[PDB]
Design a protein around this ligand. Structure first.
Ligand SMILES: CNC[C@H]1COc2ccccc2O1
Lengths: 412, 412
């Protein structure tokens, strides 16, 4: 059989807040974390805005000397990781440290550090490159640094599945636990790609909204006026825990992780198939994994990136999977407020999906002023919607056509 | 319940050849793939050699029009994946495409690509960034591009765990099959970090051999005169397959994958503990995973990087895990010849471990002229050793204290 897996801790940095309760407050209020990027000259760029983390103090987590060694994406991951473990009340002992592992990932990793060490390399040559460049930039260093700080000796790994990283990190962490390889895992993702190379990289593929005049209105999933996604920074971390382990130590359980679906589109490098056939298979796989009928699903945290083709594919995939229940369920994109945290997107959207269970409210899809053709579902336009939510889905569809779905259920 | 997993296909680019057999003949003949580097000018660098892939012809695999858009690491990953799938005899169909996934990883990913696009950003501005920069550079696109070309709609992901990437990738792809999430996975990794930032970054940390006047003698695992690892490029992919599915289609089976271990050292960001404590935990998890008596292990393919601390820690780990039987088994580092393919190390070395079982020979550790204090095991100095091998183990250890062990045995 299979052990059940519960959420006992959550941590986050978002464009909405420096922790979960502040971010969730922004979500339910419909606030935007999008704004022109500061302390960066973007004159020559077609996009000049996104979701920055505002006022982050790494010295709440790290000495200034240890933070200097580490790319912002790693700092963000450690901050969410540290928040999550503390949120869980968990006490690490010699008796259980071998049973606690980490799977924190990144889409893109250390661009900002890579850009700054390039400056030195090109200007002054190879000897001005930092000694800490490699371990300070590689994606498995949130997992590494976290495991070293807390004495975690369980499964230590990192995923990098572009915009699906957060969803895949959590899902596969839940497997580790379910199949008895670990009793506890810290899982999710972090991202800081708002450098030249990120805005330029995504800018060159014309993947980004270029609505520089109204940055708060740029991210407008399923609206007829959307012109691409909004690039955002942050981290999410959940503490995943075997149910009996959680009950024994008297843990507060937010919710149960019942289902994880993966699939591949095998279609295109950056664009989904128009009918969302891959997101449909992935959701069906997640619901089968959870032993649930599609009818039982109440709330979907959509990928909902605000790209023409991505938004429309997700409607086709929901209508396909859910048939006559697809109007009954509520589906929103919190990217309408946060923008697209890429590899952290699924970590923070898992947390929003768990909080929708706790608080019995669908987050809004803000900026959905004029739904596009066939976007006739309950997309929770403009304002939060209190309702019954027993089961909640979080979807992530990324480059390479890599799909992930998480199923959360109320736990009592 | 838990299914058995066998190797039906393998593929490789190494510094010793453009496939498996050509690389293997070099391994058995104690040939070095290490040479001064020619694809760029390294006079400002403290280390000017490595294991390059020689005469790689991407137009054996890909149209030049697609090849141009992709980092060499992805080209290398696809070349090894394509070989492995062809070598498997597997035929992809509507009936089985949902059950065939891919997990091809990398340590650092498209560093060359990110460097070149950085140069363009700094010298010429953001409008000279390739539209292919992102999908052409991010680590999950070996998994992405493979799935698209072959139509693999199974689990689609990528691991980034530094120098452990290949072992973890192979090990967790086996767990996918073991637990029924897939019947087939293509798993391994690819690295091409031989650019300014690579040799520069590893140079800045003083990790690399600087034996520039004798590059073939630089990588000398467990030799008293070792002075850092040698940086090498390439790819390894295997087709992992449920046993009954392999039997059902008359698949040739190289060997069985009976054991996977992970652990975290939780010691240091880049230094292994001198006692090999995390390594020992990892190998013990793997042998317990395979239900084996440690005395059944005949051959260990060591991580064996040719760093002072790494090499001694491995001896300590092996002595501690294997006690007196540590003196009966054969251990070698093929890094003595290939150098360190970082994220791809685990993938090529897993294939060497399988060929050690097929051909009943321990590959040599070349350059082991003066074994260091305490390095008194059978490390197969200088020359291949024909011997009985039923059980073969492949170890990797990475930055972040991340450990991986794979256990293989003959299948009849
Ligand atoms: C063990 N629970 C506390 C976590 C979160 O707060 C931390 C902050 C800094 C360093 C370690 C930390 O550990």
């Amino acid at each position: 059989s299979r052990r059940r897996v519960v959420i006992t801790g959550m941590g986050m940095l978002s464009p909405l807040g420096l922790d979960v309760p502040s971010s969730w407050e922004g979500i339910l209020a419909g606030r935007s974390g999008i704004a022109p990027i500061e302390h960066m000259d973007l004159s020559a760029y077609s996009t000049r805005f996104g979701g920055s983390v505002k006022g982050f103090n790494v010295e709440e987590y790290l000495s200034a000397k240890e933070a200097r060694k580490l790319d912002l994406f790693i700092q963000y991951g450690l901050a969410a990781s540290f928040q999550a473990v503390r949120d869980s009340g968990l006490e690490v002992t010699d008796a259980n440290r071998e049973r606690i592992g980490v799977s924190m990932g990144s889409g893109i990793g250390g661009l900002t550090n890579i850009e700054n060490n390039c400056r030195s390399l090109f200007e002054q040559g190879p000897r001005r490159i930092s000694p800490f460049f490699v371990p300070g930039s590689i994606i498995n260093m949130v997992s590494g640094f976290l495991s070293i700080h807390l004495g975690l000796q369980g499964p230590n790994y990192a995923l990098t599945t572009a915009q699906t990283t957060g969803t895949h990190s959590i899902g596969m962490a839940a497997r580790n636990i379910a199949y008895g390889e670990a009793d506890v895992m810290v899982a999710g993702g972090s991202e800081m790609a708002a450098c030249g190379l990120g805005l330029g990289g995504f800018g060159a593929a014309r993947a980004l909204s270029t609505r520089n005049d109204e940055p708060t209105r740029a991210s407008r999933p399923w609206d007829r006026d959307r012109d691409g996604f909004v690039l955002s920074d942050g981290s999410g971390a959940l503490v995943l825990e075997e149910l009996e382990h959680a009950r024994a130590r008297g843990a507060r359980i937010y919710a149960e992780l019942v289902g994880f679906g993966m699939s591949g589109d095998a279609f295109h490098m950056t664009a989904p198939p128009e009918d969302g056939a891959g997101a449909a298979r992935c959701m069906k796989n997640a619901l089968r994994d959870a032993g649930l009928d599609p009818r039982q699903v109440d709330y979907i945290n959509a990928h909902g990136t605000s790209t023409p083709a991505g938004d429309i594919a997700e409607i086709a995939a929901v209508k396909s999977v859910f048939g006559e229940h697809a109007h009954a369920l509520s589906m929103s994109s919190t990217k309408s407020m946060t923008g697209h945290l890429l590899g952290a997107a699924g970590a923070v959207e898992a947390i929003f999906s768990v909080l929708a269970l706790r608080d019995q409210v669908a987050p809004p899809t803000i900026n959905l002023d004029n739904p596009d053709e066939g976007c006739d579902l309950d997309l929770v336009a403009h304002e939060a919607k209190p309702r019954k939510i027993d089961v909640a889905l979080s979807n992530s569809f990324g480059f390479g056509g890599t799909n992930g779905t998480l199923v959360f259920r109320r736990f009592a």
